Structures are given as C-alpha cells and as structure tokens.
C-alpha cells in the first residue's frame, strides 16, 4: 500500500515506450510516445493518475522528468516527487524485472500485431493480468487488493 510508481523510458523497436512500474505489485502501465519531451511525459503522467492511485512519482535525471511543467503538475496532483535511481534495491529490482517481462511479453505479440501500441496494450494484460503465482496473485491482483484497502 505505498503507490510508489517509478517512470522511466525505454526503447523496442525503435519505439519510445514510457515505462511506469507500481513498485508493491510490479504493475506496469506503458504508451508508445513520439518524442522524449516533458509534453508526452506529463500526458502519460496525467494518464497515469487517471487510472491509477499514484501517491509517489521517482525517475531518473533526464529533462524529460525533471521540468518545470512536470514538478508543477505532480505538485497539483499532491503527488510527492523524487530522482534518483536507485529510489532503493527494493524497488529497482522490480522495475528491472518488469522491463524485461515487458520486453518478453512484448515480443510473444509482436508477431500478431501491425502497430507497436497494439502489441504494448495486449503485452500489458499478459504481465499485469495473465501472469501470476500458480493459485497466487498476479500484479492486478496485488495492486487491486491494496487499491481496495484504501478505497473502501
């Protein structure tokens, strides 16, 4: 129950993909962006909190993350804001996990698939909702069930 979300971004094909990984669950909500601008960025963040319960943002250095309009955004949206990776073991362990899932799953679809959003969309329900311990939780699952401990 922290919705510590860290955001980074990576690279497929040559698809720009923006990474956000929920680090209690190792939930994963990813967007193809065109460019590598705190514009997109502040879309996917806004996107993000749309969906989800995000009380901490961390992220590395890179302008992208750390420009006036996106402090000024999490700052509106109550969201603690931090930089530096590793925030801690802990959690950079998850997200690196979760991009290499991200990257496997993404691969299974890729040869199903025109478009690289399209692939990202069905690898996500793959790792988030599909995957999971045998009669255990999945990401969702884990996520969900601290969701609901906070929303009663």
Same mark, same amino acid.
């Given at each position: 129950?922290?919705?510590?979300?860290?955001?980074?971004?990576?690279?497929?094909?040559?698809?720009?993909?923006?990474?956000?990984?929920?680090?209690?669950?190792?939930?994963?909500?990813?967007?193809?962006?065109?460019?590598?601008?705190?514009?997109?960025? =502040?879309?996917?963040?806004?996107?993000?909190?749309?969906?989800?319960?995000?009380?901490?943002?961390?992220?590395?250095?890179?302008?992208?993350?750390?420009?006036?309009?996106?402090?000024?955004?999490?700052?509106?949206?109550?969201?603690?804001?931090?930089?530096?990776?590793?925030?801690?073991?802990?959690?950079?362990?998850?997200?690196?996990?979760?991009?290499?899932?991200?990257?496997?799953?993404? =691969?299974?679809?890729?040869?199903?698939?025109?478009?690289?959003?399209?692939?990202?969309?069905?690898?996500?329900?793959?790792?988030?909702?599909?995957?999971?311990?045998?009669?255990?939780?999945?990401?969702?699952?884990?996520?969900?069930?601290?969701?609901?401990?906070?929303?009663?």
């Amino acid at each position: 129950g922290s919705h510590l979300w860290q955001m980074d971004n990576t690279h497929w094909n040559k698809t720009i993909i923006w990474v956000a990984v929920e680090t209690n669950s190792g939930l994963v909500e990813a967007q193809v962006i065109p460019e590598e601008t705190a514009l997109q960025v =502040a879309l996917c963040i806004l996107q993000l909190i749309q969906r989800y319960t995000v009380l901490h943002l961390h992220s590395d250095n890179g302008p992208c993350f750390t420009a006036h309009r996106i402090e000024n955004l999490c700052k509106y949206l109550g969201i603690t804001k931090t930089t530096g990776i590793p925030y801690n073991p802990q959690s950079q362990g998850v997200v690196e996990r979760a991009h290499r899932d991200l990257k496997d799953r993404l =691969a299974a679809y890729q040869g199903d698939c025109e478009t690289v959003e399209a692939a990202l969309s069905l690898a996500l329900v793959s790792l988030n909702k599909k995957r999971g311990g045998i009669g255990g939780h999945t990401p969702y699952e884990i996520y969900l069930e601290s969701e609901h401990t906070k929303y009663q």
